[PDB]
Amino acid sequence: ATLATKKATLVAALKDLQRVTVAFSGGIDSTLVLKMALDVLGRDNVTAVVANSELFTDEEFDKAMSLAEELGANVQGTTLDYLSDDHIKNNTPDSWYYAKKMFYSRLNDIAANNGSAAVLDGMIKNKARSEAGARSLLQEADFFKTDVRALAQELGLTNWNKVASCSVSSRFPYGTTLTHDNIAQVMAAEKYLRSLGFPTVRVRFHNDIARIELPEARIGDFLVFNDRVNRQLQSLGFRYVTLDLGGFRS
Template sequence: MLSRLAIEKEREIKMNLTEKLDILKENLRNMESLVVAFSGGVDSTFLLKVAYDELKENVLAVTARSSTYPEREYREAVSFIEKLGARHMVIMPEELDIDGFSKNPVNRCYYCKKELFSKIRDIAMENGIKYIADGSNVDDMGDYRPGIMAVKELEVVSPLREAGMTKEDIRILSKEMNLPTWDKPAFACLSSRFSYGQEITREKLEMVDKAEQFLLDEGFKQVRVRHHGEIARIEVAAGERIKFFNEELMDRVYAEFRKIGFSYTALDLKGYRTGSMNETIL
C-alpha cells in the first residue's frame, strides 16, 4: 500500500501532467492548422494523436522515407496512421545527395533537418497550412543537436517543448492513451551511428541496419550498432548487457556481423546512451 506521501507525490505528478496536456491542447487549437513531421517515434506519435484529436482534418502528417531510416520504422509509422485516420503524405528526401552531408561533419544534422523541413514547408504552403511542428521535447535541449538551428531558421514550432513536456511525461501520457509507442525504445536516424568525419555511404548504412535488425531479432530492445570502419561497437540497454555472457550468442553475433562486413565486433561496456557519438566533441 502506498504511503500518504507517495500518494500525494503521485497526485502532484498527475496534476502537472494534466496541466501540461491542457496547455498543449490549447496551443494546438490556436494554431488552427498544422503539419506534423511524423517519424512514428514516441514523441511524434503522441504529438500527432493529440493534434488530430484537437484539429481533425486540419492536421497533415508527413513522413520521410530514405536510406537513413530503416524500413521497419516506416512500416510502423504507416500502420499507426492507418489506424488513426489522419491525412498522411510520404516524401522521399535523400540525405546522401545533400552537398556535404556524406562527409559527416559535426553539424550533419543541420543539413538533414534543413532539407527535411524545407520540403515540409513547401507542402504546408501548397496546402494552406499555417504551422509546421516537430516532436522535440524539453529533454532534447540537453544534448548537442545542430538540427535545432535549422528548425529555428525555418520557423518550425515544437509544441511538446513549449508545453514543458519531458520524454517521461510523453511516455506516461502515451500509455494512458493506449498508444503503441509508449514504451518504444528511442530511435535516431542511422547516420548517427558514424563517428564525425567518417564518410557515410548507402553500403555502410545497410550494414548498420542489418546488424541492428539481427540484434532486435535476437530479442534485444534498445540497440545501437556504431560503425567504426572495420569495427562494430554494440550498445544495448544497461540491463541487457548481461545477455552477452552467453558464448552461443556471442558466436552468433560475431558470425553474422562478419557476413554483414565487419571484421571485428565489440560490446560497449557502458551500454546504450543518447548521443554517445557526441562524447568526443562535448
C-alpha cells in the same frame, strides 16, 4: 500550472492555426500532438508526415505510418536524400544540423503545398526547427514529460514507439564517408543481432572492423552466438567481427 490550463493553451493554439502539418515520429510526444490536432481541427485539416530515408530503418518507417493511420489521420510519406548533402555524407559533427535543416525544409514545402499555417513537432520543455519556423506547441504550453503522460491517459492514448531510434550516422566516426553500401551493411548487422534477442545493440563501423556494443549484462548470454554472428557479419562485408569490452556506449 495545472494540466487543464496547459491543455487549454494547446487547444487554443491549434484552433488559431486551423490547418496543420505534423512531423510524426510515432513517439508519445508526436502521438499526443497529432491526436490533439485531430480532435480540434478534424481529419481533413491535419496532415501527418513520416520521413523515409537511408539513415533510419525501413521497418521503423512502416511502424510510424501504421500508428498514424490508427489514430485516424491522413498520413503521407516523404522521402529524403540525406546523403546528397556533403556535410551529412562526410559525417562532420555538424551533420546532425544539416540533416535536421533538410528535414524541416521538406516539411515546409509540403505545408506550403497543402495550405497549412504551421509545421508541428513533438518537442517538450526538457537549431533548425526554429530557423524554418516549426512550432512546438507542447513546449509553448509548458508541457513536461509528466504532463505528456498525464494528458495521454486523459485521452486514452496507450500505443506509441516506446524506444526512440537514432540516426545510423552514429555508427560512423567523424570524417568517415557514408555510402549506400556501408549504411545498408551496418543495418543488416544490427537487424540480425536484434533477431537473436538483443534489442539494445550497436554495430559501430570502422571500415573492415565491426565493433559490437551490447549491454554488459547480456554478454554472457551472447557467447553461444559468437561464431554465427562472426560469419553472418563477414557475409555482410566485414573482414573482422569484434565485441567491445566497454559495453554499450563505451
